[PDB]
Symmetry: C3
Subunit: 133 residues, 3 copies
């Protein structure tokens, strides 16, 4: 199979969430590609996000499979209410064993301290497929 997988978006809804929720469009269907084992290096690339809020805003991002979150991180501003919420590039890299029950990979996000989360431009979820055989 093509060993490179990719999904990209030019925007997402403006979301406020206390729990991880799917970023629509950042989804790789691994099972649909016939990939049932080996490893995937997965990159979640959100180069131009921002967060608005009243209390040191930010966004948690995760890579999740059907089995749940495999990796996560966040950016946060260094002011309680920034003068202007600047664009804070974010990248997350994880390697996943597909033989462990993985059928899909997706990007998720969750609010820091009740922030509104913003993706209004290019963002991507990428994967490279490696096998030992």
């Amino acid at each position: 199979h093509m060993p490179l997988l990719s999904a990209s978006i030019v925007s997402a809804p403006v979301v406020t969430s206390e729990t991880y929720v799917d970023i629509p469009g950042l989804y790789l269907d691994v099972a649909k590609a016939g990939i049932r084992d080996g490893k995937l290096q997965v990159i979640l690339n959100v180069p131009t996000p921002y967060a608005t809020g009243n209390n040191f805003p930010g966004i948690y991002f995760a890579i999740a499979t059907n089995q749940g979150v495999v990796a996560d991180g966040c950016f946060t501003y260094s002011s309680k209410v920034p003068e202007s919420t600047g664009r804070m590039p974010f990248t997350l890299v994880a390697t996943i064993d597909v033989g462990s029950g993985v059928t899909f990979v997706k990007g998720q996000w969750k609010s820091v301290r009740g922030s509104a989360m913003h993706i209004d431009s290019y963002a991507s979820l990428s994967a490279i497929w490696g096998t030992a055989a």
Copy 2:
């Protein structure tokens, strides 16, 4: 062919530009490597840039081919005139079909709100070649 491509620099000129312009040295010649089809996962990695200016400075970065920009994003500061313009790591990831007429990939940049753009250390443009055959 080697499926890993890479170009790196330790500096660029200080540029002010209203339009995307080439970051000298961040250029992959795909055609020269004999790669005429398949997909390239391309990473533009500018880990230590800064921007100076008078109006919430920042830099737009793009991945471009001979056919134009395929992906772009930016970082911006959260103050009109930051006390000190800190280093703002930036990464951009895109996957490109080479069979669509691609002969080269390059990194580009453009000013946010008339910023001077600064790369004065390591930066890289990387690609991994994948084929379905």
Copy 3:
């Protein structure tokens, strides 16, 4: 061999250092995997670091082999003493010739202006192995 290598951590010690020192756990043993030539695309992904200090704090990060640093960069805050030291995602990408004497790859860090360096969540060092043969 599996062409994907990966090491990840959920925390590191709090370190103050004027010199590059190893981030424990971010280490790929290339020689142990039987990889004695070709190229490695290496990604150091520290999505959620922060630095505390008195003088525009930050962290230098490097990719190093047994032969020393191959690439480095940093993030820094734009205030002398930030109100709150926010999370500053950081990614570094380098491609390395393994035939040049490389047996391991590791992530390193060093203080900016006497900062305490913080990793208290997921971080990763990843590599994809490419050969021309």
